[PDB]
Amino acid sequence: AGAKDIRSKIASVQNTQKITKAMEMVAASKMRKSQDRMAASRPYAETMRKVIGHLAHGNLEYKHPYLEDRDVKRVGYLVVSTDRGLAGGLNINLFKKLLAEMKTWTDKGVQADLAMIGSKGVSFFNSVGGNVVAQVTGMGDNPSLSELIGPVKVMLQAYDEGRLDKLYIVSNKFINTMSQVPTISQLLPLPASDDDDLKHKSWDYLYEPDPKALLDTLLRRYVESQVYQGVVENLASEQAARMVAMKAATDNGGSLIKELQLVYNKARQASITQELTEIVSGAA
Amino acid sequence: FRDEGRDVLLFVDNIYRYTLAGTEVSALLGRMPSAVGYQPTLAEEMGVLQERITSTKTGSITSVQAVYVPADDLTDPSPATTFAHLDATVVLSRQIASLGIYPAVDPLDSTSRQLDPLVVGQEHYDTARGVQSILQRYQELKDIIAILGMDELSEEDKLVVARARKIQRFLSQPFFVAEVFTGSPGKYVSLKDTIRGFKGIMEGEYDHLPEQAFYMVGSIEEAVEKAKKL
Amino acid sequence: DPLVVGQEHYDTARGVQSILQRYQELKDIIAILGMDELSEEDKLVVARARKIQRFLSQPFFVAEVFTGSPGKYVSLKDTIRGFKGIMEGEYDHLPEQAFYMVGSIEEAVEKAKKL
Amino acid sequence: DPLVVGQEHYDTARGVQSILQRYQELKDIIAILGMDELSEEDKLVVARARKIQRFLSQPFFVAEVFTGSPGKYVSLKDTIRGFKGIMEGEYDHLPEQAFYMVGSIEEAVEKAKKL
Amino acid sequence: TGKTALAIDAIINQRDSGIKAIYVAIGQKASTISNVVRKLEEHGALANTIVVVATASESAALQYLAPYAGAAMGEYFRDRGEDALIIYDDLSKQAVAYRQISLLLRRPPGREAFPGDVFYLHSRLLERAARVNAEYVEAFTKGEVKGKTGSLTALPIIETQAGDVSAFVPTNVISITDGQIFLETNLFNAGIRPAVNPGISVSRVGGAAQTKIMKKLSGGIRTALAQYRELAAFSQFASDLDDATRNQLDHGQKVTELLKQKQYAPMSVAQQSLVLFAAERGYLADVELSKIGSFEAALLAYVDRDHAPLMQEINQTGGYNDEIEGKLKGILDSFKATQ
Amino acid sequence: NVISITDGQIFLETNLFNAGIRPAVNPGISVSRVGGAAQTKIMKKLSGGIRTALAQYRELAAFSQFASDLDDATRNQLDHGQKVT
Amino acid sequence: DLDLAKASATDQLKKAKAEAQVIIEQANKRRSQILDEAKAEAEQERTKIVAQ
Amino acid sequence: DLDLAKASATDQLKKAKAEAQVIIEQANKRRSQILDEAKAEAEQERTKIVAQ
């Protein structure tokens, strides 16, 4: 033991607990901003996916590489992550689940191409040994699709030059203010829908310009919108996880204070007793 | 005064000073010190003081004793010895006083070991348990409301918060000395009256009154009068 | 000392001490921040140190009254084999509770089968 | 005292002490929570604090046997000038060791050129 | 940390009050006492102060009984119907002298080897400082004066070691007194001098000791600083905050900046009053930057230049009312036009 | 008392011994006042750098527990301190 | 409207000139105050020194 | 021209205030100078008068 050093540790832990409380404040405010931005993003992606859903079952159809169900030789993943710590184990769980599915493809002899949106993902997968083909880091407090387009542009080129056959996006769903889950979702080759063809409503704009080029542009927009909503939702999840972790750290700091103080009190009492015993005995 | 058959109140301005003066006298007499430097007869002197404050077949002496804990150490021999004799603990709070609630007694830290169903009565005991738990739950929801906001709460959660506010305000009381400080005439609430009031607030009656109806209003039957005017 | 006890025994004991000392150092980080902020290597050593601590236990014959478990006698070769196996990660796939109150490492594997 | 010493001298000393006091409180903050939790102004303060705490060091003629370097004597005016320059940011861009174990601030920029 | 400085500046500020002053130097080294004496005559009047000196080279009995002799000298004024102010520098060193005396006489030792009656040393030393009613002083003075009330204010000084407040002598003195001015060290090293610390430093006599204008203009300073303490911890690593909290934080930071001043510059009640008024009514809210010291100096210079009558009235009365409130508003409004 | 008397100290620590650093010498808490005079010229020359290197290595190692990426000047000193240890 | 713009502009320019006159006049007042107060303070301290 | 007149008025105000500022700072320098000179004069007189 020792009185001054224990009291120094008590002061330091007190200060750290106060700081963790403040960091919880910051995390909560950032979550508010992130969730309202998510609310803005939701309708646009929702409507666009409804569009492509009805295109999944239309008549007077024609082929498109992003539409057909081609075989899988290699798989692409668009991975979102934080660039910061103190967010609990969100990134770890998402990385583990992606590693599980990538292992499943590796069993089948199917290779994985990875594009990272965060620094933690870059570090984790370059040190573990995943083939990072694209990467962007440090997006900022307000993220924008403009900077994220580049990695998506690379992945799109990988698909449209024929090398990449199936493409997935991985992100954490903002299920609630206090609950989230990591997910892997089918992105580029169009997923299934429940419908039959709607024969007619208004005018078939299709052949006013070229159908192929316009459909190309539309599916570009579709993939970009999906990616943007995923990123925004993951930032909301990040703020939630950080606030939970900060609360836990605050409680643990209080727990250490209430015990270091017992050690300090016993130390003070014992020291005073020893010194007084020396004085009284030395009187002789 | 006890032998006259009365129930007397004995106020001790500080018992810690009695203990410390005992230490000083023992040091002057030259006797060897114990523990953290206290007198060898600390427990005996404390017992001699405390054992005389009891109820006799006629008359009684109840005592309120101001307690200071050295170095905020609840294991220090003077606090540890003193607590062995206390039957109840009343804590006064600057935070409660800042809200304007008087007397500024914190209900969560104050305790009494008379508060058992077979000692005070089952109804009174369960009422006290309900009040204490409700105020504790409000103390947690207050942190949550500060951090996130009131939009997160459910209707049950909101109702608990409202009833807790009403209870907190019903704890206040106008004193006769508080006439000069506030103008309120001052009142004396019986045990059954306060039990009935807090039972009523807990079980949902007077949920339709405003929370300011309970502030410094005395008994619940006067809270309804204040709400009638309000 | 390796001159009297042998090099394999000496190395195994020193490795156990090293791992457990590192675990003690990591405890104070874990206490405030939890296990998430550690390096992956640090998490590996945490898992192996916890498994080592569980494997140090042993049900004695003379303690069969307080517990109910049958007693166990373990030879030196068995115990150095077990700790050498844990240190180099041969048994990374088993849960921690498999190592609690078992004898040789084989017994821990059997316990892990029934969890 | 600003009366006993140059008023400039007093302000320089007060500023150095203020900066180093502000660093000590951040020591444990950064140690547990991480460097990048800081604001950019805080990170600027951290940089200047480390540079200042290096510039306090000095080789002595009588401490030459222990280290293997010549001894340095700095005039008071030069000391005030160097610390004023560091606090005002005139040498923000030099590395930490450019101030370590040197004499006047001119010697600091010479060693910075060598670095 | 400025204990001696605060004491001697109080003494210096009693140049023109009817309050006589006494400075007791216990264990102080001789040359420091000479420096303080030259400062006292240099920055004001030593004619109003009795200086009791017992350096480290004199016998333990003399040091032990120096504060009691000073107490007798102050008690003269106390019971003559006049007010006085006494400072006991390093009461801890008096306790040390008493320890030495007791141990050499073979008396039984106590907690920190101090004799059993060390509490009865400082307690009977300090309980002689009091305010006295008219009947006592009139009977004592045998009717020389009829209606006045004398007093002896005391400002003892204690040195803690590494800031340990639970030591025997400090805890005895803290129990004996009523209110303490706690001078924290890391605020002094930070340059915030004087380094008083709110929250731990209190005044048990309350606002009944303040004059009315100082009482009205100081109630919100307590609240602003209290809010600042907790919100500033959050300040260092936060942005995009609620503007109410932003303003609360920033106003706390600047009111903390305001409450600091040079050593030998004492401030009259009117000057302090108008500076606190500028802080409280928000005239600093748009000037929340490093200039605050120069701003205060310029405000004082301007007010001296053209609005002296209010200064005289406030210094004489200490009163406050609506007309005074509006006149202060006018002064600040006019000053904001100037440098 | 004994620490006050001698011309130097060599500190042996339980933590270092358990960690596997044997002999368990702690630099920065152990010094030799005779210093470079008590060495052959070659040993003087070479030991001069080691003394500062280890002491500042431990400071960097404490200061950078959690920064995943780092400036490679401090990376060089960190790795070199590990090598010398 | 252009006529109004010119009129208000001239008024504002003249107002700025008047404010400049007043501000610089207060600067001169401050200078005189500082100079003569410094002289008086110097004499006061000198007389105190010879008295001492 | 309306906005240019606004800018001109603000600029003229600030220029006049800075030109007052230079006077103030020069006066401060002069006060320090004259106080130092008077202190030296009185102090040397003290020395020689008390010696004689």
Ligand SMILES: Nc1ncnc2c1ncn2[C@@H]1O[C@H](COP(=O)(O)OP(=O)(O)OP(=O)(O)O)[C@@H](O)[C@H]1O
């Ligand atoms: N407001 C201030 N501005 C500048 N310096 C100050 C101020 N207040 C005090 N000081 C300085 O603090 C130093 C210590 O002052 P002081 O002697 O009053 O402290 P103390 O705590 O009583 O010390 P000690 O117990 O050593 O005598 C001095 O150098 C003094 O000039």
Ligand SMILES: [Mg+2]
């Ligand atoms: Mg002092």
